[PDB]
């Protein structure tokens, strides 16, 4: 009995996986546009806060090479409300 | 290895998990796969004293990527800044900053 | 390097000290040992969680399965110790003076 | 035969529980070579798909691979599903 | 923020009522090391869950097998020789 | 609003530990041609009340050579950890949906050994000391015993959450696939299992070992709209449970430690490999390994 | 703010370590290493070590440190001590405050000095990824590949184990 | 070390699609099947080109494409669209194992209205082809240029000349 | 012990040394010692007399600090890399942290106090296999990590133990402290040329092993624990003093016995450094070192010394030791220096 319902579940599985597999690229597409969208927030802040300061004109490349590195959750939100961070960091985590 | 005796025999002993760039289970990939494959790729048959100083620059992104140190200190003095500059008022945050 | 990361490299430190000085008893300076591992278990635990190092999550746990190995023979010198010399005090392991 | 029965008796007698786990034990490391299943167990395993199939460029000549999910091109997981 | 809310109030009130209570009115080490000693091989057995789902689940079977006979073997010669049986 | 939840299930547990003990020495009672509490009040339903406020009004004398810290610490970790793992329990939907629930079970179940440990060495007696050793290492085997038939049933379920229990359970009773098992994990938890505290700690641990018994074993069926379905059938079988719990108290000479250990070691470790082996290959031999997502 | 869960944690695995190196009762000094052990679970918690966290908890915490109970319980020296019968083991521990004092300090006011390492360190919350693990828990996958990319790390950590139940009983044999 | 090149917020609007998860969920199924190509082409550009910024004009298709598949379904048969995520949106685990009437209720329509079939088990997680116009990347990790490795040793082997040449040790 | 079990004891300890020596990852390396740790304890318990436990807690305790201080080192390249291979480390804190922990387990600088007691409270036999096989292991991962090694610290290890090894073996009576006294000298010889060359310093090892058991088990044929008692071997056994004083003499590396050869070569491969400064002073102490080796020669076979009455018993009867190995391992650690140009064979 536990044959039968288990690969009954591994059926329901796959399915659920061909779901999300059918349904993954819109949220890439959309996490594409938010962490970009992130960015270019942070950045045109950037151009309004920091002038006073002797050379650190906007937008410097941390990283010699021109890839595009993944960006790291610091500068993502950063200066944002505590709650955003706290919920964007932890979160998943917390949830339970 | 002293003695290379997974080499001569061309068995896997250690070889699966020595670098994070290896054949990772259902290809979950490391946070600077991208870096260490050029610092690796790279450094191949060059020999530790040429390529510890022609593949530098390969190497210090991808420890500052490892560490994150440098862009840490970036935002370090963004924030310093900026505690600095809108605490006597010289500036505010947007709508979106504040949510 | 975030302030957490030398938070247990710091305590490896104490931890070492601790078990680098006897004060009067070698349980506690067993206790001191794995203490040691247990900052080197967790230090080890944020690299390779912090890294996604996919494959090096392995090393925890048999750094922690094989830190036993050295606490498991640990105790049992000190019940060998402390069973003739009767006390765990450790100023009674001058014996081999020549 | 007359030294193993006895010894089998010998063991089943006084104890019942180790001759037990032994048998068990037995089962359990000698059965997994046998079944036409372990060779099931590990297809179905590898048919759970869980990163995306990223899809390769098109340049002609494989016919193996298909154009859209619907095409009977490539895997076929209907031995499954009388699985 | 709800895992140590629970854990928070579950010794609050347990210090509430312990505080209500008291303000209103070699064998032995033998075995505890075996225990230790399969305690630890314990922990090495515990990731099968997620194990059974690989790819390469052929070697999975021998090495977890492996463990098992292993592990058996400790307790194996632990008893044949005195020691597992409860010393005096 | 969820904090009330937490008070809505830590103190109906507290008086469900209160609650069950007029049904022990009644059940225990009638058992031996006896009756039970049933003087104060209907049937001694109103004895709980009479000696918990009786216990709260006697003064809890304190050894002369006990340290206090100790001595009133170890019930504190003894009464956080008795109505702690009751959180993860999948009782409908679970307060916390741990995904590792069960190990999250297991390494605070088995931390119940310190207060045990504690309460003997602060007692600083030459029964306190012994009683505490004894106590200990009895508990200190049995997890061994406990990790394995956990670890060994849980490869036909499919991971360590326990919500995922229902959904492997559903057409059958666990039991029928691991009914060995049942028997070593339920023996078990016989053994493994101030002074007015240590009352609720074990007593919570006797009744959620039964409830974590339940739903391992005898599952029930979830209904995704009514839930009051999975509520009264984990009720009636930990019920059940409970009172074979008890059924068994009074039943049999208690064990003694050497046989205790010999039981154990002897008898019960080596036939757990076994069923072990037997149930981490055999979702491998039939091809029926389970999903864990 | 719960954002003091950066390093609330991590300082109190400091006075849980001082607590013990200190050498108090091996009794007091196994409450010490537990209670680091304990708080040293939520860090890696925090970190999504929940398998690897939870493992602490069963063999570190319920199991390691209870042999340790049982072995200093069996010692039972006449006259145990406590965390005041030595000043010394109160001066490092107002000592261990004191570092952790100075480091904490100057952590969250320069946040640059230059102990050992270049220190540095703001709240560890950054240092996370904005990537997703999918529906395979990394961790899981990362420990379940023991037995299919590890099948080396087993035989020498179980035959260690088998090894280490023999050197065990001959040392206590006695003879 | 370098200008980070970021797109402007102008070039980032998009028709973002506002359904939920479990709406998404329930016609997931039948979104992959009859959507492949935007989303197909799009990833392949996001593993190909390895860079989000090189993204985006496929990133406007897959989106656009969303929905142009959630417009048919509302003329045709809307209400039988609200009943089955009504029901899959109840799941806490958005179980299809307790949503078979309503999922019957969904796909007869695309089976005869849209002409439409829903896919079948390991269907969607085929690896496909995709014809594109997009160019191989030259170098999808900006590598830069390579070290010369050192000079392999040539010649045949010869006696050491004059033997062992440690100290008095002639041969 | 139960030969079985004493056997297969053994045969861990060498595959935990074996496992160090052939593998790449550095968790495997940590491995190797922490297997070589499990197994060496039980083998010093063996005699199981208080003087075996004294120095089995010792030889744990400081063994055990270094292993797990050694844990910490590799965590910091880690740290720093995100690396696991054995090629040339990241981190200069890492680089001292792990070389005091390799050399603390080797016994040669401050770190090793427990050497000369650890191997007086253990028996004879199993001493020999302390001051042999257990130093190949840290010593084949120092020549691993020779590159990256810093040379300050490395040679103000190499002074010091070279002067304590020769001066601390002046004072000693018990030939068991003479020999670990030996051993930390010879220690300071060969580590001292690590930044330089590791092809000399796996010459001194076989030099100074095979000199060792040359020595360990010669004096285990003679049955002696003290001077007094190896004085009177000369009666007893007249042959065995005679090629004991021989490798004492070939031990202090007098020309033309084998063991001068190390010392030579190390001098001038220094010497190419254009350190020479360096081989002077440990060469000058050296002499030290030969001071206490005459002095056991000489109360061995050079003079006769009062025997006992009791000792005409021990003629009748003959040993029942088959030595096996001792003959070649005298005249290997003998007469070996024509045949010097092997070198090329180690590189
Ligand atoms: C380079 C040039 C120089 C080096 C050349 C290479 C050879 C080096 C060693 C030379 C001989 C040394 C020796 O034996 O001296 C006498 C000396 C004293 O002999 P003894 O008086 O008979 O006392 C020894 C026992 O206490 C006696 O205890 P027992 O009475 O119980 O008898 C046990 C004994 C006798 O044997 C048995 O009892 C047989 C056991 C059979 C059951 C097991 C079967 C399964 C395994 C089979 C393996 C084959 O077996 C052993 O001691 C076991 C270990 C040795 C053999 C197995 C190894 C791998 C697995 O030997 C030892 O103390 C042994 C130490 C361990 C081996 C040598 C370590 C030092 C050298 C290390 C560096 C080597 C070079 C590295 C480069
Ligand atoms: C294809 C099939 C694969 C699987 C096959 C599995 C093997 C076949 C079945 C084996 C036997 C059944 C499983 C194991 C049972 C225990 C084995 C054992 O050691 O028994 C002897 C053991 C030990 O018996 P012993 O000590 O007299 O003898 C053992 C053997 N010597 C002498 C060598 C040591 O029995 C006990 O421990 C007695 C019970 C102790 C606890 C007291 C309370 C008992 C309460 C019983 C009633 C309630 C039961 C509740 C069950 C669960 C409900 C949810
Ligand atoms: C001794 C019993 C256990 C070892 C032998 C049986 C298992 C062999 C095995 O897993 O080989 C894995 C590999 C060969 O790999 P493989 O081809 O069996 O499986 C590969 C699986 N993936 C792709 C996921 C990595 O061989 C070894 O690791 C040999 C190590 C030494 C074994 C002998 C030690 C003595
Ligand atoms: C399928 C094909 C095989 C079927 C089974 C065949 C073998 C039967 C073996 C029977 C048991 C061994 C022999 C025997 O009778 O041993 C009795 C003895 C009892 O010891 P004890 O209880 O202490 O009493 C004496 C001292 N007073 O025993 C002992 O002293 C030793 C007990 C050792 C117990 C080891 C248990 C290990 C774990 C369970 C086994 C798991 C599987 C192992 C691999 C099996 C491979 C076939
Ligand atoms: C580098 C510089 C030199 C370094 C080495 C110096 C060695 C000598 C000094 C050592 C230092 C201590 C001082 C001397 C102490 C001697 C103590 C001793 O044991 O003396 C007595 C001993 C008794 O020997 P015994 O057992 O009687 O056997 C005799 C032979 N049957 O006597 C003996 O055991 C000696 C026995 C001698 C046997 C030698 C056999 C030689 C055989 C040669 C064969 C040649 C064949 C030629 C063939 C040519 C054609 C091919």
């Not at chain 6, 059940?27 to 049937?43: A, D, F, S």
């Not at chain 9, 005409?312 to 005249?331: A, N, S």
Request: glycine share 6%; with cysteine; proline share 5%.
């Amino acid at each position: 009995s536990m044959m039968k319902w288990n690969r009954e579940r591994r059926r329901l599985q796959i399915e659920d996986f061909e779901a999300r597999i059918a349904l993954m690229p819109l949220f890439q597409a959309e996490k594409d546009r938010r962490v970009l969208q992130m960015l270019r927030e942070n950045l045109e802040e950037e151009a309004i806060i920091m002038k006073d300061v002797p050379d650190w004109k906007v937008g410097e490349s941390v990283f010699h090479t021109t890839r595009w590195v993944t960006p790291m959750m610091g500068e993502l939100y950063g200066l944002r409300t505590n709650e955003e961070i706290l919920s964007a960091t932890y979160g998943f985590i917390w949830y339970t | 290895p002293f003695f290379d005796v997974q080499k001569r025999l061309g068995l896997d002993l250690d070889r699966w998990m020595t670098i994070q760039s290896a054949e990772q289970p259902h290809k979950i990939p490391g946070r600077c796969h991208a870096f260490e494959k050029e610092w690796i790729e790279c450094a191949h048959g060059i020999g530790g004293i040429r390529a510890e100083k022609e593949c530098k620059i390969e190497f210090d992104d991808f420890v500052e990527c490892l560490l994150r140190q440098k862009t840490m200190k970036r935002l370090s003095a963004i924030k310093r800044q900026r505690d600095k500059l809108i605490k006597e008022g010289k500036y505010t945050p947007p709508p979106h900053h504040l949510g | 390097m975030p302030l957490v990361y030398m938070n247990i490299i710091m305590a490896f430190a104490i931890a070492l000290a601790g078990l680098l000085m006897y004060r009067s008893h070698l349980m506690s300076s067993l206790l001191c040992l794995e203490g040691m591992m247990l900052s080197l278990f967790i230090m080890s635990t944020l690299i390779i969680l912090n890294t996604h190092f996919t494959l090096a999550n392995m090393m925890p746990i048999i750094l922690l399965v094989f830190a036993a190995c050295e606490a498991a023979l640990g105790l049992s010198l000190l019940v060998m110790v402390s069973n003739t010399y009767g006390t765990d005090y450790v100023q009674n392991l001058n014996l081999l003076q020549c | 035969a007359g030294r193993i029965a006895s010894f089998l008796k010998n063991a089943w007698a006084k104890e019942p529980v180790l001759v037990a786990s032994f048998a068990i034990g037995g089962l359990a490391i000698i059965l997994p070579s046998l079944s036409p299943y372990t060779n099931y167990a590990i297809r179905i395993n590898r048919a759970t798909p869980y990163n995306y199939p990223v899809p390769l460029r098109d340049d002609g000549n494989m016919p193996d691979v298909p154009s859209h999910p619907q095409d009977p091109q490539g895997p076929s997981l209907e031995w499954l599903k009388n699985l | 923020m709800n895992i140590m809310l629970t854990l928070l109030t579950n010794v609050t009130l347990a210090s509430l009522l312990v505080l209500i209570a008291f303000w209103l009115p070699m064998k032995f080490f033998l075995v505890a090391i075996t225990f230790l000693l399969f305690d630890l091989e314990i922990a090495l057995l515990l990731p099968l869950p997620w194990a059974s789902q690989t790819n390469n689940l052929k070697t999975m079977l021998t090495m977890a097998l492996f463990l098992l006979i292993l592990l058996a073997a400790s307790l194996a010669y632990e008893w044949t020789q005195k020691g597992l049986e409860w010393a005096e | 609003m969820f904090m009330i939840n937490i008070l809505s299930l830590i103190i109906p547990i507290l008086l469900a530990v209160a609650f069950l003990t007029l049904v022990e020495r009644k059940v225990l009672g009638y058992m031996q041609l006896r009756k039970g509490p049933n003087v104060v009040g209907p049937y001694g339903l109103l004895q709980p009340i009479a000696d918990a406020l009786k216990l709260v009004t006697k003064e809890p004398l304190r050894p002369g050579t006990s340290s206090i810290s100790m001595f009133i610490i170890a019930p504190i970790l003894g009464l956080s950890l008795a109505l702690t793992m009751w959180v993860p329990l999948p009782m409908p939907y679970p307060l916390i949906n741990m995904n590792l629930g069960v190990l999250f079970m297991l390494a605070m179940s088995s931390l119940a050994v310190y207060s045990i440990l504690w309460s003997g060495w602060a007692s600083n007696s030459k029964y306190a000391l012994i009683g505490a050793l004894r106590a200990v290492a009895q508990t200190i085997s049995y997890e061994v015993t406990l990790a394995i038939i956990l670890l060994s049933v849980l490869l036909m379920n499919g991971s360590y959450t326990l919500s995922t229990l229902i959904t492997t359970q559903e057409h059958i009773w666990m039991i029928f696939t691991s009914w060995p098992l049942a028997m070593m994990w339920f023996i078990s938890t016989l053994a493994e299992t101030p002074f007015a505290m240590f009352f609720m700690a074990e007593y919570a641990n006797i009744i959620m070992m039964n409830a974590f018994t339940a739903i391992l074993f005898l599952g029930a069926s979830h209904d995704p709209h009514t839930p009051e379905l999975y509520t009264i059938n984990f009720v009636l079988k930990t019920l059940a449970l409970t009172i074979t719990f008890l059924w068994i108290r009074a039943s049999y000479p208690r064990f003694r430690y050497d046989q205790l250990m010999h039981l154990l070691w002897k008898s019960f470790l080596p036939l757990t490999l076994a069923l072990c082996m037997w149930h981490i290959s055999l979702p491998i031999m039939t091809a029926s390994i389970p999903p864990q997502s | 703010m719960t954002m003091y869960i950066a390093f609330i944690l991590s300082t109190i695995f400091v006075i849980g370590f001082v607590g013990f190196s200190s050498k108090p009762s091996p009794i007091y000094g196994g409450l010490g290493l537990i209670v680091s052990g304990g708080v040293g679970c939520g860090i890696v918690l925090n970190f999504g070590g929940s398998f690897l966290g939870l493992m602490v908890f069963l063999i570190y915490l319920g199991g390691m440190l209870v042999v340790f109970g049982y072995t200093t319980a069996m010692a039972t020296e006449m006259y145990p001590e406590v965390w005041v019968s030595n000043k010394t083991v109160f001066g490092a521990f107002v000592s261990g405050l004191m570092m952790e004092f100075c480091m904490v300090y100057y952590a969250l006011k320069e946040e640059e000095v230059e102990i050992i390492f270049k220190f540095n360190g703001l709240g560890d919350w950054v240092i996370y990824d904005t990537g997703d693990s999918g529906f395979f828990s990394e961790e899981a996958m990362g420990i379940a590949a023991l037995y299919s990319y590890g099948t080396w790390l087993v035989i020498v950590t179980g035959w260690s184990l088998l090894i280490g139940v023999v050197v065990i009983m001959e040392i206590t044999r006695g003879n | 070390p370098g200008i980070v090149e970021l797109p402007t917020l102008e070039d980032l609007k998009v028709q973002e699609v506002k359904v939920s998860s479990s709406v998404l969920k329930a016609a997931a199924h039948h979104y992959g099947a009859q959507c492949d190509k935007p989303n197909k082409e799009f990833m392949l550009c996001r593993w190909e080109e390895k860079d989000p910024r090189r993204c985006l004009e496929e990133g406007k298709l897959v989106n656009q494409c969303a929905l142009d598949f959630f417009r048919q379904i509302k003329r045709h048969c809307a209400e039988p669209f609200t009943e089955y995520w009504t029901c899959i949106d109840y799941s806490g685990l958005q179980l299809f194992r307790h949503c078979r009437k309503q999922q019957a209720k969904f796909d007869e329509c695309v089976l005869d209205k849209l002409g439409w079939v829903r896919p079948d088990l390991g269907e969607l997680s085929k690896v496909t082809k995709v014809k594109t116009d997009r160019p191989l990347p030259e170098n999808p990790y900006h590598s830069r240029a390579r070290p010369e490795p050192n000079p392999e040793a040539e010649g045949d082997l010869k006696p050491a000349k004059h033997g062992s040449r440690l100290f008095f040790w002639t041969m | 012990m139960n030969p079985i079990i004493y056997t297969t004891l053994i045969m861990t300890v060498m595959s935990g040394t074996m496992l160090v020596m052939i593998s790449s990852h550095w968790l495997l390396i940590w491995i190797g010692f922490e297997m070589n740790l499990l197994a060496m304890i039980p083998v010093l318990m063996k005699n199981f007399n208080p003087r075996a436990t004294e120095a089995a807690t010792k030889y744990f305790l400081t063994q055990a600090t270094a292993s797990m201080m050694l844990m910490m080192a590799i965590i910091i390249n880690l740290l720093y890399s995100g690396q696991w291979t054995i090629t040339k480390m990241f981190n200069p804190v890492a680089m001292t942290m792990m070389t005091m922990a390799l050399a603390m387990k080797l016994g040669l600088s401050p770190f090793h106090f427990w050497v000369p007691e650890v191997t007086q409270g253990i028996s004879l036999q199993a001493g020999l296999l302390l001051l042999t096989w257990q130093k190949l292991a840290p010593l084949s991962v120092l020549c691993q990590i020779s590159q990256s090694i810093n040379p300050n610290l490395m040679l103000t290890m190499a002074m010091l133990s070279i002067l304590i090894g020769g001066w601390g073996g002046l004072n000693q009576t018990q030939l068991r402290k003479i020999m670990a006294y030996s051993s930390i000298a010879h220690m300071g010889w060969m580590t001292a040329v690590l930044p330089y060359n590791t092809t000399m310093t796996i010459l001194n090892l076989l030099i100074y092993i095979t000199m060792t058991l040359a020595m360990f088990m010669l004096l285990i044929h003679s049955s002696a624990t003290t001077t007094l008692s190896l004085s009177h071997t000369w009666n007893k056994m007249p042959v065995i003093t005679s090629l004991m004083m021989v490798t004492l003499l070939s031990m202090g590396g007098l020309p033309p016995l084998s063991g001068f050869m190390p010392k030579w070569m190390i001098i001038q491969e220094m010497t190419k450094n254009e350190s020479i400064i360096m081989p002077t002073l440990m060469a000058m102490t050296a002499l030290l070192n030969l001071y206490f080796y005459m002095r056991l020669a000489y109360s061995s076979s050079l003079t006769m010394f009062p025997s006992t009455n009791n000792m005409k018993m021990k003629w009748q009867f003959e040993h029942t030791k088959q030595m096996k190995l001792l003959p070649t391992m005298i005249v290997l650690s003998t007469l070996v220096l024509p045949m010097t140009p092997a070198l090329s064979s180690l590189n």
